[PDB]
Amino acid sequence: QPEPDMITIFIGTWNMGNAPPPKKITSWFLSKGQGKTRDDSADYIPHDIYVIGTQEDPLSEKEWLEILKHSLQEITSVTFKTVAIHTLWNIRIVVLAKPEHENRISHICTDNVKTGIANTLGNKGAVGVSFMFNGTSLGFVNSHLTSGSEKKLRRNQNYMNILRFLALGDKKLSPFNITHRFTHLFWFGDLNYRVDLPTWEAETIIQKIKQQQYADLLSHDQLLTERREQKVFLHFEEEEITFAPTYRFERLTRDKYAYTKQKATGMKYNLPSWCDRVLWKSYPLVHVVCQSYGSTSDIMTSDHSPVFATFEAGVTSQFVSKNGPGTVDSQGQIEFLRCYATLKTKSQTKFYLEFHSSCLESFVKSQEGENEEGSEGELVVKFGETLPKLKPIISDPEYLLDQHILISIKSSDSDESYGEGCIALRLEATETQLPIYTPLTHHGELTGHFQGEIKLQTSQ
Ligand SMILES: C[C@H](O)CNCc1c(Cl)cccc1Cl
């Protein structure tokens, strides 16, 4: 039984509008409806992992698990195993996997973050799951962000609180937030970003949706515009949206958008919007391909339609040599040449680096770099040729070229990270000086850059 080098992952997000689901929700798991949909010929082929995010979910965990498992069994004839289930208020995440994966999945973590203070703390936030799948770390975030067309800034704040405080993955990666802890990170939910057009244009928007002419609406989608201006979800991907806005429908049909202000909406308009989204971020040069992104047409119990996305995701095997794990493989080394960090910080402290990777026995601290002034005001931290030689646990190129080095630049004064990034070892050549680059972020905001050269020695 060979270990996989690819798996397929289903991501579902559905704001259920505090209503039980209908008797059949199989179209969701089959990626059928509007948008980028799955080929009929694949219907019986199970995904390896199904990750279901709900919001405004009125069901018990037990009730929803029974519906999900019975749904997948009907589609696939496979009895899926429950990896994890976590609920915060009415925000839920379920992870189901094929039974053959039970002994490939380990280090299962769950957490939640509650967003807002006093007034604004009570029902919005995120749940998350992480685990190892063989040698690959996978994280999944289901967030219900602040509602309302005029709260895009609040949503961006909710995003930053969730990525700062959601405690998933390897706690030894202390400088790193969830946006660096995983080979593949999927973030989905009712993100609640709106199509930002005048209220008077509601009927015009509806007309455009009936014509399947989304271009003039997506150009006002607050998530696309905020992402384009690097206000939120920096370094995340989203597939092109080719399905109608998933909010706000009249229940029991999909023929009508209910957008007019009502006491029940706090006298707010709900112009048709793409509230319900799936984004991802994978480490550099790892295979990840979106194979569906759409909405169902036949599930109408909520004022939202379910959204599906599916992915091919590269995975690696749990590598064992004669040497590592449990020693170094002297045949292997990672060297850094001519490296420097460019930082946006206005501070003057000394900086050092930390290198973190599961290819190392433990993280490595550099000596301090030498600060200089950039020509446009910047702080440049020069490491020259002073960075340590990293000793990986396994030298085999089939393992080592699949690995990544996380970098944090830390203040010597405070040991606080000013920036985090990631470097792929999937090089064009070994034993060859090659340029490397990563942007550096902190709390998911751009704080600088790290660039230089790498020289990777494998046992080949
Ligand atoms: C590799 C990714 O495609 C980068 N995405 C950046 C981006 C955003 Cl986030 C929004 C609008 C346009 C663009 Cl290029």
Contacts of residue 374, Cβ cutoff 8 Å, sequence gap at least 6: 342, 380
250 lines ligand 1 (CB under 6 A): no
Beta strands in 172-284 (DSSP E): 184-190, 276-282
DSSP 264: G
Q: Among 416, 453, 444, which residue's Cα sits nearest to residue 181? A: 444
DSSP 3-state of 232: coil
Smallest Cα–Cα separation from 189: which of 267, 275, 114? 275
Q: What does each C-alpha distance from 58 to 21, 71, 192, 350, 411 come to in angstroms?
A: 9, 18, 19, 52, 47
Q: Which residue, chain included where needed, has tokens 């970003």? A: 193
Residue nearest to atom 2 of ligand 1 (CA): 237
Indicate which residue's Cα is closest to atom 14 of ligand 1. Answer: 228
Give the strand pairing for 404-411 and 6-15. Answer: unpaired
Question: Cβ(448)–Cβ(343) under 8 Å?
Answer: yes
Nearest to 250 by CA among 275, 268, 270, 266: 270
> From start to end of 74-160, where are the E strands?
81-88, 91-97, 105-114, 125-133, 136-144
Q: What is the resolution of this structure in A?
A: 1.5
Query: Rounded to 5 degrees, what are φ and ψ at 73?
Result: -60, -45
Cα→Cα distances 3→40, 45, 90, 133, Å: 27, 18, 37, 11
Please list the residues that pair with 143 across neighbouring strands.
126, 189
Burial of 378 (0-12, 13-18, 19+ CB in 10 A): middle
240 lines ligand 1 (CB under 6 A): no
Contacts of 444 (CB under 8 A, 6+ apart): 159, 160, 163, 164, 177, 179, 234
Residue 339 to residues 229, 322, 375: CA-CA distances in angstroms?
Answer: 29, 33, 18
Contact between 238 and 304 (Cβ < 8 Å):
no
Q: Which ligand 1 atom is the nearest neighbour of the CA of 237?
A: 2
d(CA 31, CA 35): 9
CB of 321 within 8 A of CB of 394?
A: yes
Q: By alpha-carbon position, which residue is closest to atom 10 of ligand 1?
A: 228
Name the amino acid, one letter, at 167.
A
What CA–CA distance (Å, rounded) separates 12 from 164? Answer: 24
Q: Say which experimental method was used.
A: X-ray
**Cβ of 237 below 6 Å from ligand 1:** yes
Strands 91-97 and 81-88: antiparallel
Dihedral sign of CA atoms 245, 246, 247, 253 in order: positive
Which ligand 1 atom is nearest residue 233's CA?
9
- Closest among 207, 210, 251, 293 to 15, alpha carbons compared: 251
Strand partners, 189: 143, 277
Find, among 9, 33, 35, the residue nearest to 240 by Cα. Answer: 35
**Do you find a cis peptide bond into 325, omega within 30 degrees of 0?**
yes
End-to-end C-alpha distance for the chain, whole angstroms: 27
Is residue 191 within 8 Å of residue 277, measured between CB atoms? Answer: yes
